[PDB]
């Protein structure tokens, strides 16, 4: 009966993998909540990056030209050199 | 009829207005299976992670084309009235 009791005194032995799995799983189900983190950092720093970088995150369809006919800059508005 | 007395009573046409109920009438039953072969629930709406994407994302990209839109119709109701519409000529 002793052998008995070593297997169940043995099926706890690995209890610290046991919890690093269970966090690990809890991990994973929280992965998912990138999918909105990342994009939403990067549209409250848009601004901040330069009009180069702009325009490479977004694929091409932000440019200069798309910069509001009333831009923030008044002496930039439709281009560094204004509209004409 | 009664009107403005303490025998106001509702008239003939509103009791006839509430007599239709129109029990097992759906006529828009057509928008709600046309919308949901989109399959927006499955994809997105279902999930809270995802949920929370298609309303930073179509924020995202909602908010750019709005402004789009309606850059263009400001362009168009005030055309030539805009000083990116009329070049200055510089005196001689
Ligand atoms: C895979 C599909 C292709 C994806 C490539 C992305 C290219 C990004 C890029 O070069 O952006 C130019 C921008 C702007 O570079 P730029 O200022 O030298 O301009 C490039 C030249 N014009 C203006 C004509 C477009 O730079 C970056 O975004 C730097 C990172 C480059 C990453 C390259 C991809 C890896
Ligand atoms: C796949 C491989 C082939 C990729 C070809 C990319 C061509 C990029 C190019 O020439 O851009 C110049 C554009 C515009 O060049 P520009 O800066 O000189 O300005 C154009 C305006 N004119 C001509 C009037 C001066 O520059 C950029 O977009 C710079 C950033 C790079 C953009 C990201 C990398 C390319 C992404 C390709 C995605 C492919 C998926 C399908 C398309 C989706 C979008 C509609
Ligand atoms: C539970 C609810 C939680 C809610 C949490 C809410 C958090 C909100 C965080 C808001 C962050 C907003 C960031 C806005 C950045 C600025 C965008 C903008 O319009 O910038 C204006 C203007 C634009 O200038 P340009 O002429 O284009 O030339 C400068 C270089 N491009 O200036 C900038 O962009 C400068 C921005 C600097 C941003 C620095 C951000 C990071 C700082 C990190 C360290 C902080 C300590």
Known sequence: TLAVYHRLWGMTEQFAARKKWGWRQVYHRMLPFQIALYPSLMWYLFGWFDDPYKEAMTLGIWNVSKRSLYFWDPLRSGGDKGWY | ?92
Request: hydrophobic letters at 40%.
């Open chain 2, 1 to 92: 009829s009664g009107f403005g007395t303490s025998y106001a009573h509702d008239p003939k046409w509103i009791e006839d207005w509430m007599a239709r109920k129109r029990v097992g009438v759906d006529r828009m039953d057509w928008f709600f299976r046309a919308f949901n072969r989109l399959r927006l629930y499955e994809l997105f709406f279902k999930s809270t992670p995802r949920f929370y994407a298609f309303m930073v994302i179509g924020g995202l990209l909602g908010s750019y084309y709005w402004s789009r839109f309606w850059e263009q119709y400001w362009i168009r109701v005030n055309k030539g009235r805009l000083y990116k519409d009329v070049p200055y000529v510089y005196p001689p």
